[PDB]
Amino acid sequence: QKIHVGPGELDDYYGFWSGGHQGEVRVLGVPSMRELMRIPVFNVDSATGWGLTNESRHIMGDSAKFLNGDCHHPHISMTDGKYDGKYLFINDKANSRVARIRLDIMKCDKMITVPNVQAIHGLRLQKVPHTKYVFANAEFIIPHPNDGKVFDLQDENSYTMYNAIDAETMEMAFQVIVDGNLDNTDADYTGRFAAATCYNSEKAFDLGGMMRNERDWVVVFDIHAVEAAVKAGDFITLGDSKTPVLDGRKKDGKDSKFTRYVPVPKNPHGCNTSSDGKYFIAAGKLSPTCSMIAIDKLPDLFAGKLADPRDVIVGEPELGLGPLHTTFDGRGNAYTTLFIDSQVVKWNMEEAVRAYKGEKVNYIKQKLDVHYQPGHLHASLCETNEADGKWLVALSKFSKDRFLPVGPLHPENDQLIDISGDEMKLVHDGPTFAEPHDCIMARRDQIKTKKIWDRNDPFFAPTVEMAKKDGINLDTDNKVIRDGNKVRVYMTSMAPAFGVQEFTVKQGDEVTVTITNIAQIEDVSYGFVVVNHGVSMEISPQQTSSITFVADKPGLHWYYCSWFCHALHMEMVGRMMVEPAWSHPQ
Amino acid sequence: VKESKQKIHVGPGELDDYYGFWSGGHQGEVRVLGVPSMRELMRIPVFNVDSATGWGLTNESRHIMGDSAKFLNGDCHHPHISMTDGKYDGKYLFINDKANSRVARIRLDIMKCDKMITVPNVQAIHGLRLQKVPHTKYVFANAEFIIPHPNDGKVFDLQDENSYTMYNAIDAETMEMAFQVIVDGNLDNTDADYTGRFAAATCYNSENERDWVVVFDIHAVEAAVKAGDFITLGDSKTPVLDGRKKDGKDSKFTRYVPVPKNPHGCNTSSDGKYFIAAGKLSPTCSMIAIDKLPDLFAGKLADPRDVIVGEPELGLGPLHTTFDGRGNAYTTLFIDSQVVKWNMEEAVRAYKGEKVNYIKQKLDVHYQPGHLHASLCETNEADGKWLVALSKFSKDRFLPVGPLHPENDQLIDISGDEMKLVHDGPTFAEPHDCIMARRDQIKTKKIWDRNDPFFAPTVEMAKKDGINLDTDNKVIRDGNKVRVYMTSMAPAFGVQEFTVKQGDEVTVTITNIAQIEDVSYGFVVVNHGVSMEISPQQTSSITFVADKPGLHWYYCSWFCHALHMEMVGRMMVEPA
Ligand code: CUZ
Ligand code: CUA
Ligand code: CUA
Ligand SMILES: [Ca+2]
Ligand SMILES: [Ca+2]
Ligand SMILES: [Cl-]
Ligand SMILES: [Cl-]
Ligand SMILES: [K+]
Ligand SMILES: [K+]
Ligand code: NA
Ligand code: NA
Ligand SMILES: [Zn+2]
Ligand SMILES: [Zn+2]
């Protein structure tokens, strides 16, 4: 298995890394582990203008007021349990958002603030028959309504909710109230069942209380029952949201139609579907085990053919101190991170199941040391029924002495491990910034990217619509439109000349600059910067971009093209002239 | 005979040999790489807003940025490291902001931006370089674009006698302006000699069959400043000297050396003999003899062209030059898409008419190189081991990732007689230029000092409230202001709940009293756009308004402990 990608060689896999609390998505080549691209999502990106431009702020909605995000879990849309390469979804824990990235243009094209919740943490996609739903955990219990009259998490109206988002429209589909709280989640290989771990079955707010119970649980959702209740109109709404809300709590011991609670020790964390579709595997964290939920026993559990919810557990292997996450090679082994022991442990799921039935046997195959304190791990295609068992990335939280010193803040250490053989082999230490939690890999042929924009692309269609009201054809017009104290500049661009090289406004005017890059070549991107106005954006081939700012300073102000595009790059410039307020009315 | 055969694989457990400091380009940060692995070890926020650490959101960072904290963007190109006696001393890194006309200082012991200045009365700081000898007293900075003076909207004509740009000197230690020099034309790039007397800059817009490199007599400038012979502009107290030619007469502070053609790069050879100006539109470099500049300013030379001692023909589109310390220069050919290696002394002899070939090798790069940088090339210790060429079009060299492409930063072994390309490093947002330093030239703190200037103003606020940041967990109420102070020790915030009134302006100050390297904590307030880092022994603070009634969770964002998920707290906001 080639480990090094020489000059002129291409990587075999795409890797999509979460940005952690830096808020972006990063695109890596695997196995070289080099960063090919950054995709801004919840961060403000100076280079492309994401969070400054009118297109990006329209996608972010009211949340464009936040300059931060915290993402953990990137996942790729699937058709029949295999990646189809259309979309990447990722969570925002800091401002309770889910974002969709369009993998053909590698940009965030949709974003939603999940109503009536705080902190979207766990996120995963339906696998079968395709990704109809994005499943998203809200982590923290809050009052409903949260109007400041009740603060107690033990009140009957204090709770958190499981969230399903329509992948294609990126509108809420439903929400399910649960007991306890929600950590990570996964889905089965039929479309019926999803599952989430809970660590706060105590509904406490202090550390001691959140650890009291010997077992919390994984809550299992019967999505068919949920949809059936929705189509039946048997749901409520909260506040101003029209999202159907269903009640998944126990009510005096009796289970909801929508949920079952499997007792699992202890403050469990990871929740991973095996690539063969047999198991939900929950990482015990404070318990030195994983718990294996048999998905094929779930219909019986929901029909009361089982006497005890624990009867869906068919294994609970002892793996080591602080199991956090599990991934799969597709050969019948699971790999689990041990945060405290700082290892990855390879174990055989079928043997662990036999040992739970008393058949004494050694299901642990190998323990590999990692550096240090691993969180997530990801084996190539592990989330599909094409799990290929080639590469394994383990994302550790303390790199200590593994890289040159760079001050008090250290990088993370994302370590690439060869699992194609019987023995795991550590091959590469990859330092990353801001704590990626999780990543996801796709084969090179599973991702198809556009090199030039289509002119009808929904990303800037609202801008095309604005132009039409001014009688503007964006493909050819270089025009300055005036409307009271607003000025709308429309221009084409072809290196090294802006189509409007100068224009004049009154001090205080609100200026929108719309630029259409009418180039038809690849890698031919232009920029636009207005000096000393905090204005910056990218316009790639056939794209239209626009940015709005206030001409608050009298005098002559230069604008320039930022993206090196030509041998005459530092000469693709223009001038905005701002007439002083004292020479105009008022 | 000596071969180029350095090892590029830094396996697990092994450490890189050099630090690389990459500019962030249009993204606005600075990036720290290990060389030769070319892996990114750290990002240093400067002009960007960084969700992870809170740079741009915290009180400490917005204090450093001053009024310019209102800008969420930057555009940097030129990172440089402070020198003592012509050698890197590891103290500071400086970098430019072309978009909002700033210079930033980074302290290399903490790897944080600690000072920032908006340069007055100019637009767009582009070229930037450091005084070398006797140390980096001055940061030299080019303002690129010509503007009216004053720029109040009465005059827009760029040919007006009061429309010009200026060369800028910033005091490196105080990060206050030292002086500005009005010049003719446009400034592009700049460098300094190895004595402290001279600096030089290419000018592309003298408007021209020839533009020039302008040469500054920094001693003469300092003399005038100390005798009070200067004017000031607008409301800036900065001494301003007039370096323009007047009726064909020369300023005391400047000489204009004719050089073709829209010259771009301006690079000082490591032996200190030459300012080398890359020809861009002319397929040449021009070599100015620094030891002839005293005679130039003394009026002992018949013609400003007399200080030119070499003009080698290299290829199409020379943009920049670097040095191996063995007597070779390395120049990027932007059109030919090559690095050309050439011998500077053979170039000088050729210029006299000897038939001697000074070109040693041309290496193909991919594609369209701009800047290049050999290790320690800006110092008299240039070691001739590694070369990075930063190329603007990666085309097919990496997997496709949509309409936007990465820059291709190519690592080249120059240790032997033949350059060898050994690695392609894709980078985001056109870093443009970089600088390398030996591992042993950089010394960083592992934990913060409690007296650090970075958060000294926050320590002062706490002093006014009577707070001992090392021990106290308290909530001060002051009208509609709320100042929460707390220690933190994973897995617990030192204040786990507090209550305020809707609309209160809340300041949260957190001190990480851990003593263990790498145990960094975070603080995020859910749905309030609040996020910051607190590393060991650091104090950080952030102000926001509690505009939403009800219970609002905060949590630690830096995975710090087995019980990370449970290190949380509650803000309770009583309705108005
Ligand atoms: Cu948010 S948690 Cu184990 Cu995913 Cu990092
Ligand atoms: Cu247009 Cu560079
Ligand atoms: Cu504090 Cu994780
Ligand atoms: Ca618990
Ligand atoms: Ca010119
Ligand atoms: Cl998980
Ligand atoms: Cl230069
Ligand atoms: K870390
Ligand atoms: K580029
Ligand atoms: Na939306
Ligand atoms: Na300052
Ligand atoms: Zn440059
Ligand atoms: Zn350049």
Instruction: Give the CA count within 13 Å in the CB-facing half-sphere of B476.
Output: 16
Interchain proximity A449–B400, CB inside 8 Å: yes
Query: How big, in percent rounded to 5, are the helix, strand and coil portions of chain A?
Result: 10, 40, 50
Contact present, B243 and B224 (Cβ < 8 Å): no
For residue B531, the cross-strand partners are B524
Residue B128 to residue B112: CA distance in whole angstroms = 19
Neighbours of A461 (CB within 10 A): 13
From residue B491, give the alpha-carbon distance in Å to each of A268, A321, B441, B560, B563. Answer: 17, 18, 36, 8, 6
Token pair of A230 as six digits:
């929705």
Residue B21 to residue B437: CA distance in whole angstroms = 8
Neighbours of A427 (CB within 10 A): 18
Select the residue of A105, A142, A426 nearest B402 (Cβ to Cβ): A105
Contact present, A395 and A411 (Cβ < 8 Å): no
* Amino acid present at B203: C
* Amino acid present at A567: A
Residue B42 to residue B34: CA distance in whole angstroms = 9
Contact present, B485 and B494 (Cβ < 8 Å): no
Contact present, A111 and A98 (Cβ < 8 Å): yes
- Interface A-B: count of C-beta contacts within 8 A: 380
Contact present, B480 and B501 (Cβ < 8 Å): yes
Contact present, A13 and A3 (Cβ < 8 Å): no
Report chain breaks in chain A, C–N > 2.5 Å, as residues after which they occur. Answer: none
- What's CA B328's distance to the chain center, in Å? 26
Put simply, whether A236 touches B (Cβ < 8 Å) is no
Q: Which residue of A has its CA nearest to B336?
A: A567
Residue B191 to residue B202: CA distance in whole angstroms = 9
Report chain breaks in chain B, C–N > 2.5 Å, as residues after which they occur. Answer: 207
Where does B131-243 show beta strands of DSSP type E?
138-145, 147-148, 163-171, 177-183, 190-192, 198-203, 211-217, 231-233, 236-242
Helices (H), A232-378: 298-302, 349-356
From residue A301, give the alpha-carbon distance in Å to each of A270, A293, B186. Answer: 22, 11, 78
What's B537's DSSP letter?
Answer: T
Contact present, A230 and A244 (Cβ < 8 Å): yes
Name the region of B537 (left: φ>0; alpha: ψ -120 to 50; beta: rest): left
Token pair of B375 as six digits:
């290790």
Instruction: Give the CA count within 13 Å in the CB-facing half-sphere of A387.
Output: 23
Q: Report which of A575, A529, A555 is spatially closest to residue B234, judged by C-alpha positions.
A: A555
Contact present, A183 and A197 (Cβ < 8 Å): yes
Max CA distance (Å), chain A:
92
| Mutation choice for A interface testing from B526, B537, B540 by most A CBs within 10 A | B526
Token pair of A103 as six digits:
């993998």
Token pair of A20 as six digits:
């952690």
For residue B163, the cross-strand partners are B148
Per DSSP, the three-state class of A445 is: helix
Residue B247 to residue B165: CA distance in whole angstroms = 19
Number of helices and strands in chain B (H, E) = 5, 41
Q: Using H for helix, E for strand and C for coil, what is the string for B546-568?
A: CCCCEEEEEECCCCCCCCHHHCE
> Considering only CB atoms, which chain A residues are within 8 Å of B400?
449, 451
Neighbours of A318 (CB within 10 A): 15
* Element (DSSP H or E) covering residue B38: none
Q: Report which of B384, B310, B388, B316 is spatially closest to residue B354, judged by C-alpha positions.
A: B310
Contact present, B519 and B560 (Cβ < 8 Å): yes
Residue B384, judged by CB atoms within 10 A of its CB (0-12, 13-18, 19+), counts as: buried
> Considering only CB atoms, which chain A residues are within 8 Å of B62?
none
Residue A168, judged by CB atoms within 10 A of its CB (0-12, 13-18, 19+), counts as: middle
Contact present, B505 and B545 (Cβ < 8 Å): yes
Contact present, B23 and B434 (Cβ < 8 Å): yes
Residue B319 to residue A541: CA distance in whole angstroms = 26
Q: What is the resolution of this structure in A?
A: 1.8
Token pair of A505 as six digits:
């406004």
- What's CA B479's distance to the chain center, in Å? 42
DSSP string, A170-235: -SEEEEEEESS----EEE-SSSSEEEEEES-TT--SSHHHHT-SS-EEEEEEEHHHHHHHHHTT--
Residue B452 to residue B540: CA distance in whole angstroms = 12
| β-strand pairing of B285-289 with B308-310 | antiparallel
Where does B397-549 show beta strands of DSSP type E?
407-413, 420-427, 434-438, 474-478, 481-489, 492-493, 497-501, 505-512, 521-525, 530-534, 539-545
Contact present, B233 and B121 (Cβ < 8 Å): yes
Helices (H), B337-410: 344-352
Interchain proximity B72–A52, CB inside 8 Å: yes
Contact present, B58 and A77 (Cβ < 8 Å): no
Name the region of B569 (left: φ>0; alpha: ψ -120 to 50; beta: rest): beta
> Considering only CB atoms, which chain B residues are within 8 Å of A554?
151-153
Q: Which atom of ligand 1 is nearest to the CA of A324?
A: 3
Contact present, B118 and B102 (Cβ < 8 Å): yes
Please give the distance, rounded to the nearest whole angstrom, from the Cα atom of residue B357 to the centre of ligand 4. 78
Per DSSP, the three-state class of B460 is: helix
Max CA distance (Å), chain B:
88
Q: Report which of B216, B162, B163, B213 is spatially closest to residue B193, judged by C-alpha positions.
A: B216
Contact present, B64 and B113 (Cβ < 8 Å): yes
Q: How many residues appear in chain A?
A: 586
Q: Which residue of B has its CA nearest to A38?
A: B428
Contact present, A259 and A221 (Cβ < 8 Å): yes
Residue B454 to residue B64: CA distance in whole angstroms = 8
What's A56's DSSP letter?
Answer: H
Neighbours of B522 (CB within 10 A): 31
Domain boundaries, chain B: 1-455, 456-575
Please give the distance, rounded to the nearest whole angstrom, from the Cα atom of residue A231 to the centre of ligand 3. 42
For residues B263, B266, B272, B273, the Cα torsion angle rounded to the nearest 10 degrees is 0
Instruction: Give the CA count within 13 Å in the CB-facing half-sphere of A78.
Output: 25
Q: Which residue of A has its CA nearest to B100?
A: A532
Residue B104 to residue B93: CA distance in whole angstroms = 8
> Considering only CB atoms, which chain A residues are within 8 Å of B61?
none
Q: Report which of A326, A370, A375 is spatially closest to residue A349, judged by C-alpha positions.
A: A326
Residue A326 to residue A345: CA distance in whole angstroms = 9
Contact present, B267 and B321 (Cβ < 8 Å): yes
Residue A567 to residue B316: CA distance in whole angstroms = 11
Residue B315 to residue A99: CA distance in whole angstroms = 49
Residue B294 to residue B480: CA distance in whole angstroms = 65
* Element (DSSP H or E) covering residue A574: strand A573-579
Sheet holding B87-97, edge to edge: B80-84, B87-97, B102-107, B112-118
Contact present, B163 and B194 (Cβ < 8 Å): no
B225 — phi, psi (to 5°)? -60, -45
